[PDB]
């Protein structure tokens, strides 16, 4: 309900005085209840030593810069990054969903005592927040763009011998109530160097945890946990920047195939996914070294537009909204071209096409009663 401490204490004391009994709780009880849920409270362990990672297990919020170089004689940067530790956040999420996974495994006709390993498929996401400034007046002082970095446990699976069975599935994966945040900072999405400097420790922790084994004591007995990370929560603007490809000016448009814009208009359906992180690193190394000593254009079309070095293994994906808006935007021009009788008119005029558009809009508004607009949506 977005209740502050002072107002909550006022409500508590008012209800306690008007009722006599202590129905609500004091402030220290609420502080204990919120500290028992924050990351860095319950103990855990890892079967591998997890090199380059500390073994301390009572740490929570930390500075996201991870030992910055803010001295005056260094590259200037004005950001405030606060983050949780990856393993601590995962342990906290597991201790939170302990009851849910217990209920799920009880409903799935399984024993109350059953060790792991629990295959935990986790979704990864990252996106900015636009404008978060709170300046009432005094003109547009600063844009003050922010950015976050969050994860979401997608599913949990367990097996009984050889047969696997999905023991936990999220009801709403792409929702707001299941966004577990790792890091929060105030930096522009286009700011590459600061974003890399902030996200490098998290990527290191993730690649070190990819091949580890967590051991927890949540259900009174030792439970083992594995993890599988999938970075599918990246939009096009960020997946065309963190992967090394050009942002928008490249002829290559497919983030899965190496087909140019010209070849895409000819070959429609016959394609395949020919992109990965290792091949992108190889293409960047070839671009940097250039052992063949070729021209710039041929080297560019040989590296398929790779110019920057990728550092985050991403798994791109699309949604239905973009597909349907693209299909409708194409069909709109198809209707214009078929109503303008262009198959018999080789070269028309822009004013004639605008007249066609106006006539089609009026006919549609008169028959179907629809409001045309250039700004397209879903």
């Amino acid at each position: 309900t977005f209740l502050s401490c002072s107002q909550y204490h006022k409500m508590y004391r008012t209800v306690k005085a008007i009722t006599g009994r202590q129905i609500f709780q004091p402030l220290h009880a609420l502080r204990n209840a919120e500290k028992v849920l924050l990351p860095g409270y319950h103990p855990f362990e890892w079967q591998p030593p997890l090199k380059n990672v500390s073994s301390r297990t009572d740490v929570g919020i930390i500075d996201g810069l991870s030992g910055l170089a803010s001295s005056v004689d260094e590259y200037p940067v004005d950001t405030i990054a606060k983050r949780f530790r990856y393993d601590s956040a995962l342990v906290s999420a597991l201790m939170d969903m302990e009851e849910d996974i217990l209920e799920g495994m009880r409903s799935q006709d399984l024993d109350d005592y059953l060790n792991g390993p629990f295959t935990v498929v986790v979704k990864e996401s990252c996106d900015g927040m636009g404008d978060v400034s709170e300046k009432h007046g005094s003109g547009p002082a600063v844009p003050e763009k922010a950015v976050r970095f969050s994860f979401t446990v997608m599913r949990i699976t367990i097996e009984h011998g050889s047969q696997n069975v999905k023991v936990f599935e999220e009801p709403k994966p792409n929702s707001e109530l299941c966004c577990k945040p790792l890091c929060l900072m105030l930096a522009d999405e286009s700011d590459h160097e600061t974003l890399t400097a902030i996200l490098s420790p998290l990527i290191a922790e993730r690649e070190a945890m990819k091949s580890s084994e967590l051991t927890l004591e949540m259900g009174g007995i030792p439970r083992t946990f594995k993890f599988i990370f999938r970075g599918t929560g990246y939009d096009e603007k960020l997946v065309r920047e963190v992967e090394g490809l050009e942002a928008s000016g490249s002829v290559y448009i497919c983030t899965l195939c190496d087909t140019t814009r010209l070849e895409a208009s000819q070959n429609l359906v016959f394609h395949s996914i020919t992109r990965s992180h290792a091949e992108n690193l190889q293409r960047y190394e070839v671009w940097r070294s250039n052992p063949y000593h070729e021209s710039v254009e041929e080297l560019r079309d040989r590296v398929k537009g790779v110019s920057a070095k990728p550092f985050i293994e991403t798994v791109p994906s699309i949604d239905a909204l973009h597909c349907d808006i693209g299909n409708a935007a194409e069909f709109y021009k198809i209707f214009q071209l078929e109503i303008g009788e262009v198959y018999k008119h080789p070269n028309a005029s822009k004013e004639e096409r605008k007249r066609w558009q106006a006539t089609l809009d009026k006919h549609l508004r008169k028959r179907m009663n629809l409001k045309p607009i250039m700004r397209m949506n879903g």
Partner: protein, 346 residues
């Protein structure tokens, strides 16, 4: 000693603290842009032409047999004239990494107002130095032969003792002197008993037989050594010989800029005196046969924007010209976020 404001073009966001200004036949080339090379300039080098107090950024392409390199935010450049070319070592990858490859940048063609570079890479063998930034490398001549003298700066923690909460923490490198032979890529380290701790963001001046180390900052003690160094080197036919001596006359300066005014006479500009206050005093060094004498200038007046700021950067333009940059004040909220000025050394 005359301040002069310079107006910037449209691609002003490509300028970041710690760029590089190379000189070729009087023409200045800008290197070390911000981010990654876009579709306009796939290389990253530009012509830093300035007319009527207005600078332009015209891209420059490489040769067919060249090699594309990523931009660096704190490299080590030295004027190696043995034709004319430059040698870049160190730097900082835009992905917050440190590269330890030597890039040989030379001009292979210049006609019809168009230039052409032949940037190639060269590896190191033997006592290879760890990847680092902020260091300065020079070339010294002896017995008709040339040799590269490099003094280390600072770098990240070693992979063995590196953790997550200190993933970006850095420290000064080991105080060693490395001799790099560009004829075969052979590096050899040398230990000196007079060197106590590391040093970063210093000034390196050499006249054909000895590199002078002026100013600098030490991270281990968070202070600035006020003692200069005199590294007398010699390259005999057999084993090399290097000697270091301590002499009075140092200046507590860090991140200073060095340029040449007259023959064997350089000038130091304001860097950073203390970690909190701003340095404004500037000194000039005059060389002779073996001695060295320092002196100040006639306190050139600055503008209000420079005195009211806190940090800045810049470099030299070769022909006695210092190009510095002042960040825009957020209080005005109407600025290009980076002011730029120039100083006529004369």
């Amino acid at each position: 000693m005359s301040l002069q404001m310079v107006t910037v073009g449209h691609n002003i966001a490509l300028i970041q603290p710690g760029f590089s200004l190379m000189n070729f036949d009087g023409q200045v080339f800008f290197f070390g842009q911000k981010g990654w090379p876009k579709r306009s300039c796939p290389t990253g080098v530009f012509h830093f032409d300035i007319k009527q107090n207005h600078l332009k950024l015209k891209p420059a392409i490489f040769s067919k047999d060249s090699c594309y390199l990523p931009p660096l935010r704190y490299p080590a450049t030295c004027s190696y004239k043995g034709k004319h070319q430059y040698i870049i070592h160190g730097g900082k990858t835009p992905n917050n990494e440190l590269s330890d490859k030597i890039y040989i940048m030379s001009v292979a063609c210049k006609n019809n107002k168009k230039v052409t570079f032949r940037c190639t890479e060269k590896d190191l063998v033997g006592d290879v130095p760890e990847p680092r930034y902020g260091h300065s490398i020079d070339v010294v001549y002896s017995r008709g032969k040339s040799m590269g003298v490099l003094f280390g700066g600072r770098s990240y923690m070693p992979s063995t003792q590196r953790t997550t909460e200190k993933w970006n923490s850095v420290a000064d490198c080991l105080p060693h002197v490395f001799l790099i032979d560009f004829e075969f890529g052979c590096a050899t380290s040398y230990i000196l008993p007079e060197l106590q701790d590391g040093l970063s963001f210093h000034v390196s001046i050499a006249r054909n037989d000895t590199v002078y180390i002026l100013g600098g900052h030490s991270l281990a003690s968070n202070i600035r050594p006020a003692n200069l160094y005199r590294i007398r080197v010699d390259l005999p036919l057999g084993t090399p010989a290097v000697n270091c001596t301590v002499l009075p006359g140092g200046i507590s300066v860090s991140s200073a800029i060095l340029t040449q005014t007259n023959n064997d006479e350089f000038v130091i500009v304001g860097g950073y005196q203390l970690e909190n206050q701003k340095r404004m005093v500037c000194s000039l060094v005059s060389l002779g046969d073996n001695t060295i004498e320092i002196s100040e200038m006639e306190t050139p007046d600055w503008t209000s924007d420079i005195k009211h700021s806190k940090i800045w950067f810049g470099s030299n333009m070769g022909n006695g010209t210092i190009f510095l940059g002042i960040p825009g004040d957020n209080k005005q909220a109407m600025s290009e976020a980076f002011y730029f000025y120039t100083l006529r050394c004369s």
